Amino acid sequence: DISSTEIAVYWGQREDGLLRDTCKTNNYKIVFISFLDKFGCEIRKPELELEGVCGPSVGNPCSFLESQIKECQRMGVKVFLALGGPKGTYSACSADYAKDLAEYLHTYFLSERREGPLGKVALDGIHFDIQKPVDELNWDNLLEELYQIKDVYQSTFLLSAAPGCLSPDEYLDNAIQTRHFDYIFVRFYNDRSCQYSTGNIQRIRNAWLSWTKSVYPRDKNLFLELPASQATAPGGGYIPPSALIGQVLPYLPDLQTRYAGIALWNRQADKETGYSTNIIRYL
């Protein structure tokens, strides 16, 4: 229901502040480190570069994040790695490369087996934010290889996706139809056919309904992903906090069984406007 709302947030830019400080706010239950956005056929060991934060181009190594990640997890926050994003050049390449990449993610990000870009860690999940890939092929293969690895080691990491709000999604529909994601974060912004606007919840309500019908199983596995300010959604979609709580959430069909909470793009925007602070007050 509404009171059990969990909040997620994207993190990975200079203006976001430190990861540790983001967790210690205690506003969030999930944080996406964003993004791993360059990989494809000839890139056997993908590197992480966070703009103005860490990477070979910044002169500060991303492995300094290891202790902050661990502090977050200790205080009950789940830390995901997000693939893809609005920028970069990414592709799953082929059925063979999809196996290579799934093994790479498991060895270096999910099991503490070796030292990787974020140091020696075991993250809580992998998040498919496939907004603008080279093409739509092989994303289902990547998902299915990670799912299989989970069975082999009896691991507990989670798998999630962030499709656009118009079903069926151009890039992730085959993957979503496997029924093997744990969570779906539907992006209700930058699309006039399915987002909120002042005095009209009919299009977002209908789109929520379409997603409850086409996503199985029928668990609490659906989040709304929304912009945390007007500035991070030049295509529209921003919902003021009082309108979210009062005019939108009470009127989503099957809220009781399907709704898991909200995700905010992004941490910088959230700091600037107090979005999640005002939501938490009205819970």
The domains of the chain, with CATH numbers, are: 1-283 (3.20.20.80)
In contact, 107 and 123? CB cutoff 8 Å:
no
Whole-number Å distance between alpha carbons of 102 and 118: 17
Cβ-based neighbours of 77, under 8 Å, separated by 6 or more: 23, 28, 29, 30, 31
In contact, 175 and 140? CB cutoff 8 Å:
yes
Sign of the dihedral defined by the CA atoms of residues 129, 131, 135, 140, in that order? positive
Q: How was this structure determined?
A: X-ray
Q: Work out the number of other CB atoms within 10 angstroms of the CB of residue 203.
A: 17
Q: What is the resolution of this structure in A?
A: 2.1
Residue 223, beta-bridge partner list: 185, 261
